[PDB]
Design a protein around this ligand. Structure first.
Ligand SMILES: [Cu+2]
Ligand SMILES: [Cu+2]
Lengths: 128, 128
């Protein structure tokens, strides 16, 4: 805990939070994502993807085009700071990343890239 | 147009209209649904479903429980007044229903029951 947060993507197409702050003392930060619900990945999969607020749009749009087999992420997208995989219900994944990749004074956004989901499944992240 | 309306459901989970006025001189009313875009039915499928504003929530919950193969509509649901099938991009479907099944002063909603889409794809239908 302290440098980790548990996140949930449900069958209603929402995340349980919309603002995560990363404490400057953390060397690494972990996101544990679970998918409560009953629906399969192909109709209601979720991932936790991080980028800057300004890159988000590019990542969601190139992710959408890559398709379900690339977990709707462009392979080696260098706008992507960190991402989990695309999980279906009852599945779980965790991503740990370097806090050094964040810089204080920049807005980040986490979001899901499964088509249409970022309209509700998104939140701000900031290093503080 | 005369006793019919054309409706579109696109890749960003939006219907092109959000209010339909059926007119009382119509014995029947037709809604012609189409889906602009490129995503298939299992990612961005849409249907047009009508029920009272009061029954929409159960129709949505039971719908989501029916599965993709049942087009996310509970078969022979008593509360659905008219519905198209679920369609992906490039697919088209229509429904004609009799205007005697709507009464004056009752509030009706049209909506899409594909998981997560109702919160964003819905509108009111009025007998005038
Ligand atoms: Cu999602
Ligand atoms: Cu829909």
């Amino acid at each position: 805990a302290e440098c980790s947060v548990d996140s949930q993507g449900n069958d209603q197409m929402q995340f349980n939070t919309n603002a995560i702050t990363v404490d400057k003392s953390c060397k690494q930060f972990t996101v544990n994502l679970s998918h409560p619900g009953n629906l399969p990945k192909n109709v209601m999969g979720h991932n936790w993807v991080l980028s800057t607020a300004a890159d988000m749009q590019g990542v969601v749009t190139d992710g959408m085009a890559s398709g379900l087999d690339k977990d709707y992420l462009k392979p080696d997208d260098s706008r992507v700071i960190a991402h989990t995989k695309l999980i279906g219900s009852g599945e779980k994944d965790s991503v740990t990343f370097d806090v050094s990749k964040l810089k204080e004074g920049e807005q980040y956004m986490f979001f899901c890239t499964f088509p249409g989901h970022s309209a509700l499944m998104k939140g701000t992240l900031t290093l503080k």
